[PDB]
Amino acid sequence: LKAQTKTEEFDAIKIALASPDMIRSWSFGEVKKPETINYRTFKPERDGLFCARIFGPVKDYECLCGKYKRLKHRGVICEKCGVEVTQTKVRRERMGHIELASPTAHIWFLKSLPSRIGLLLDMPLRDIERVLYFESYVVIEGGMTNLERQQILTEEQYLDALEEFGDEFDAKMGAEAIQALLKSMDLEQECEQLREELNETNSETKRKKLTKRIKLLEAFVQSGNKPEWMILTVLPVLPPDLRPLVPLDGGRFATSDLNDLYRRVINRNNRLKRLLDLAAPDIIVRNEKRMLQEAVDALLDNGRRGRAITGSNKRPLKSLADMIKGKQGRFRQNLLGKRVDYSGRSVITVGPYLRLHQCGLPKKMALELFKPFIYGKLELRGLATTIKAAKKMVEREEAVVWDILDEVIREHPVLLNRAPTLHRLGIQAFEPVLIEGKAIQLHPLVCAAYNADFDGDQMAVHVPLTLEAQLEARALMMSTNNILSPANGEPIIVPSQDVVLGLYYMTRDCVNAKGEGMVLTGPKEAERLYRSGLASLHARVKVRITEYEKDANGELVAKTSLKDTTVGRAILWMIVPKGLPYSIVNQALGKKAISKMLNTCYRILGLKPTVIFADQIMYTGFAYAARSGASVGIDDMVIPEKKHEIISEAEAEVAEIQEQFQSGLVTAGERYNKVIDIWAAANDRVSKAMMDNLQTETVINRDGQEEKQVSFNSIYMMADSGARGSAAQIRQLAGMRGLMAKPDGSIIETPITANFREGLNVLQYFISTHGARKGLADTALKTANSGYLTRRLVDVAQDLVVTEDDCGTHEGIMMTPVIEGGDVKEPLRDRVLGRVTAEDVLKPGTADILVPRNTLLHEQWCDLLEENSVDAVKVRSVVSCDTDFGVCAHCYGRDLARGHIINKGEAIGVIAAQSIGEPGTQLTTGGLPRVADLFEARRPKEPAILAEISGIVSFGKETKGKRRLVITPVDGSDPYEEMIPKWRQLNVFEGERVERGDVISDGPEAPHDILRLRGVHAVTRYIVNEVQDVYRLQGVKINDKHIEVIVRQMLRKATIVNAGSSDFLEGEQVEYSRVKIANRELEANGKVGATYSRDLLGITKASLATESFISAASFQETTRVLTEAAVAGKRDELRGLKENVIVGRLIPAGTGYAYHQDRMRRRAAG
Template identity: 55%
Template structure:
């Protein structure tokens, strides 16, 4: 590693005037940029070559010295150093200011750092800095006090009374600089600590803020007066370029305009001072200089922004850093890369799982350097130049070389948006004609790709290490599982499912004569021959002799099945556990999958195959399933036409019956027997039931060989809800407020709708489209915040040796009487480590030993045993100070193997929660009509509300005591719910009658139980049940939202986010530590500091854990680089500079920003000394010696 990159941490601080001069290569004195006649930079101007370096490599300004041989010489005529032109990207200049100027970040930021140091309000500070008032620096013999603020009239009066030399009062940054330089930081810090002892309320919080800033200056060693600038640094010219346009005009960076304003005003002020101009004119010029510097640093922060042509605000230095287009997010976190291309994707059904089709032209361009090297190596060309000409001409020899080059060189394919780790996968390229990339159909689900014009990008991994990683970790055939829940992601879809469904369906019994003997065959081959000769069909029952080997013995017998199922089973392993062979005998001959196979069953088959036979074998089986599915969907010839959508005859009758019932309800309403709300609900309910009855009739009517029904039932395309709209009845729609319209749509899409029906339905159709667009942005922003909070959670060690654990049980949803399981105990314990022995409550047998991994089979045994709670190791209780340990995490769901050190589990957690975000609903549901109170937030807004730890909409009342409930209805449209504890303590809650109470008289409630319907404020749970209670609540609630939307997600991902939300402690009393009262400190730092202090016999600090929302927690991270690249860039950098923060570079973002390898995966320190040796003929000796050495070392 080069010297410049060899550092462990990076710091930021305030620059002193001397430091700025040290950076500078010369003073910029003139506002000119370039000479418009010669197009050369002006001397001493903003692009001066003498200061910033030559514009052409190895050439001075006047042309006296040209060529590299004069390297390092400074021209005696023009003063330009002969060097590379790229120094113009790094050499800075400076402007020596005629009057001190304040830095707007430290004056205007929230809180104002200058204001806190001087104990002045930002408003008063502004009056001084912008020459509207005087501040007393030395009161002398007057009755004034230091820091008093006086206006112009008062100043004159004091001058006339006491004389100009008897006291000192100044205005502008000069005055503030004098005051700042007089401050004794150490004495002030001690004084503030003493004041804190007696202070209360608002005064105390103000003192804490002041002390925080003063302590920051004390610890960092920076002088407060450095917040005032005497010397202004000038950015290197290549970072604020000026380019010539076609018409001879120039386009320039806004910074040049802003610098020019500063230089003009500075020069004018210098002239006025030399001329001894009147005070009022000088003051006005100083104020304008202050405003010019403000605009340069942060345009628009104070007053109106300086605008350029077309009234557009100019982009200042702060704007260069901020936002999506700023330096952090545009250039440091995302960079353009060489060796990449993009094209439209088309399906490649004949490809293997690990292959992709790469267009020949694209491949040649991507692998050009490799091809040229091979050509020179095999002496087909003399040098690189002629090799390049050969490649550009093309020809057979070039294509043959390209074939050799790409043989063992994987490429990465990426489809934007990359929502999870499966959005980039590696493939072995296969050269194809045409200009489109061919993609294996089974990886489409992972990429969320389809072939309607989607594009994908190709990247070439260059180094041997990168290629090894691509091959072993990223190859598509190794990525068969979803990181969200560990289920297979490469399940066949659409045509493939339909083909396999067609293959495994059997005939109805009445399709053939039950008396006729079944065709019998001696083995599979004979049956297959009969099928090929059209003697039998795929679907009719046949008898066939089957021979299997069990424990070394050959068993033979006749089974009854269909030809289709025989063909399907011919590619499957026969030990997946679907067939019950426990009784032996004839059962041993059963086919493994002798049942109808749709998409759901295929998923189970693949999951078991991975579990039993591993990924390599499953990849081969998947390819065979793909081929078989396409083949038999073609043979089946299943297609749909309008006549396949058969409308049930009973539909008219059912609708007429419903209309009679509705008329009766309306009559009852008119008589006054029903209120309007009751009438509305009854009408909506009748139509809902009618729609369901028509749907049932439709199912019976279609028959199992109807193509539409087959597609839906197999899971290939469509669902019963869509079929209902095609051939049944569209039913009730929602209006713009989300309320169900009571007039139903009686027609279906096959019959067509009338005008009124069309208008009622059009709102829902449009809303879904606009919802999707909004949802994508919201979901993306949620993912970004989650990534930011969890990006430094990496598996840092094998085992943290903690004895802490959590109790897990099945998660249930619904009211007391209608509870259903949202997540089984099986899903919560599989792939986790047991904290202690898990014992069967009935047999007392140990199901899982403590400290061992719970396998799928063991998890099933635990669930079957009737155990309600299991103690497991968890991310929430991991004792790792940064990241988590492998034991507390459990298995890596993306591989199905125990997690290894270096796994970036935080990023995976964020992606797993964010990726299905677009599938969640956007709306807030009405809980029935208007009368039932507040909306309950669901879907994406609910997940956001939980992770941001916000006060929820429709907040529930929770029990603050444990005890028995009594309910009394008062006459004030309220009821009083009283909880009385066993000790006789009671607590009464007044609840409006419109709010549904979910407890009954005499119920026993525990602390934190819900009394009314709605969501709980996480902060309330935090104060009542503590950190453990709130973590459990967040996990349960987030899981419920995903489950309600049909998304499976493992709770370990949510655990990681919840852990990060509770990492901070708020200090209540600092004791003898250096921690400040009221500040937020990392929990692990808090514990370790206290342990050190206690060991010395001193007073430890006191504090409590706080729950922070994900945005706040991201900004409260120890890494200023990570926080600055997330949000509020200028605020984060201001704070970091004052505190002299040091970034320890533990997370991923910080290392990406500074261009180092990320400290995860193979970039971790423990793996850094591994080198990859390409397995090619020329490395034969090296490889053999390496293998021999490793054998010797054991």
């Protein structure tokens, strides 16, 4: 078969240096003139930056001169002025060139930090630049006389040496010099010689640089790049429409800055050719060559020399490098964003009538958005003759079009998105419901996922177009299909505020109320008792209920009974579906309980019942909260009667200690601590006064004189239910508020005695103001820090995707309850839930396997483990996965919005990064910066040091700035000796044995140490436990999984120790390496297999290494990446997410995982 020549669907991409002949291959003509357009007739001046002949026709299928105007003549080259008449679009495509007079350095390869021309020649940068500027002479191929090959000479020196040796010696200067150097260079010979020199001399200094350079050279040879190409003989010109002259209003013109630059280049070039033909003196033509160099540099990348300025405008002109780089840090237009058709946005409102699967979409918006569908559906049914008439109709908004819109809307989902998109739930698919209004209506239960208030936040709509997009939106991005946070299995659909105040008010009980003590047949006549005004919503009552238990085999058992409950609970029970026990609704129904109701319902009945359940819960919560008549008055906030007395006594203490400071019994600072302590104690007392009084003070009589229960006061119910408010804010309302602190952080010893229910005076308010402003500032800052962090995270993860099914390794980490210092800061059940078992586990007695090797532990399995006393389970993790270049689903876990095991092909790196990132706004060394420090693996300020090796140790030498520690292993050799500065107080016992990784001092320790001296499981455990300490201290739920995948990405690279295939000390992929030593253990060499050492790379560091260069050019410094890749002739195969996002094809994950896989196997095959 003939493979192909012309257009196919391409794979990979290649980048390298460009030959002059190559640059010519692209060029369809040489632009010889600085002229742009004719100045009256605006036609392009022929062979100029804007040209019809070289580039293309000005208007569609029309010759410039005007002779051939017909769409027939096409491949015709006009005789008058040759222009092939073709679409004007080809003026957006065709390149050009300029043949420079003198050679020119390409500023990218001269000024890139590791100067390419420089280190290829082993020639220092400043020397090379000194040569290019004609500031000195440099030797080339010196032969055998007096002189080194790379040696530089001055005027007089060159003269003398020339007088001595006429021939068999050579020296040039300028660009031609460097080009001659590069051309003369033989890489292979240098290779041989350097291998030898590497071998002969033993010094670290010598062979380090030696090996680095030889590797560099041989890489450059293998590239296919010849050094000469770093010096430009020919300069390509960019297509005109990519740097347009296009006219504006007022007859004014506007053009790209590349025109000024290209113009300058052409000018000085032609003038140089002229100066050559005029036989000018050296001092002139040299100046001209230099100026040409500067012009070219300014064109390519401006700012590495002089930063030339555009005509009449101070602001420096944008060069091609600046064209590529973009702005806003690193953003390549697939990054910062891209404008998109079929979209819209507006202010959002509530819409409680909605089912959770839908959203209100404004009429006009739907019309405009679905306009093309409407056009097609209108003439398909034949209501409109032609598409034109269809437009006329929808523009007239004729009566018949609304029905057609209702047709095209029905099964067609739409995507809704909010401004701060963090986790994947930031975008959710809904079924559109036509609404009269300009506002978008969004289901209340979703408001938590978007973090969307109703205070004027806006949402954007996007219309999924292709069939695949509709089905993706419906089966993936659909609201009902994500009920659970991907971070943790807990429901994100949890009722928010009004609803929970409703369910809370519903099931609650007062002491005495209408219908107290009576009995009812069932929930029906309970509700009937309530709605008729006979019985009160909350009263202690026995009613018969019928509950169910699915506890049979897949089967629902029925049981009936007389339960002691209230009227409200009885009414509410009507909603609860099937197999749930009445136990769940018989409580007070707080936010937590009202959430666990949903959770249990989902882990029992399945998805659909849970969906409709949540819906009904919302409806009833709203309705009954509305009926309840909850409100807030000024008298709802109750101040303690004892407040003033507490204030007075605590105010007596301060005058006590003040008297002592006057008499000098106590020091000023000690005094300060004392007074601050008494005032703090005061605040605690007032708070714990107002809390008792607010909470229990309802004193009410049933048939006797008195009884007291939890208060029915509004603000209390609100704070208690979890609807809104909290003990702190309520404390600020009634009790006194806090003690403030100056910006310094020195806490003021005269606290705010007054509260918000009372007035604050001038000073108090002024002092509160700082707290406010710093609050807004800090929060608004932590948003940015969160974003930056997530960014680093997806950058370090991204392409990690579930790929294989099961690697099948027994490997994994030991999962224990966290058990910190007190009782159980987090159980075992949460840590092991949804995680696969590495191996079978035991009862206290054995040959009884409860959980059999690798099995997803769901709620039932975890409860079965809980029945038994088992404290310990070994669990497979993403960090331990044997699979290379990805994670097997069997290792990951089940976690998702769905309880089933993770699908094959879902991209986990991204969702992990997101899951870690989203809560980051809620985090307060400790803190979010501590989190960053952890993920960056930064060695702390005052780190500890761990024993290098086990065995008895002792102290040696003296006081040089380090008092040396000598370790003595039992069997093995002693010589390990570390230099410990003695000015730091030690721990380690001079007479005792210390295990490797023991405490030889105090303070935090760098995870590099934990990785080396303790090992991979130990280091991953340290990272996960510390970061989880940070999050969990703030009340943030994040599964260990995501952190573990980030960790896996951190340790991706490692350094080799032994040899037999590749180089000694190289940092490299443990995927590559392990797949190589697994392959080397058999066949090949019988075993030559090398030993490596696992390395720890920070997230920002590990992100640096990416196979794909297109990917790297996105988030890294673009200018460097492009060069560094171009010299190696690096070939990007795509294969990742970011790269395929940039190039604009299907993501090698998700739905596209079926595509890229089917193509991946076709590649490197028959």
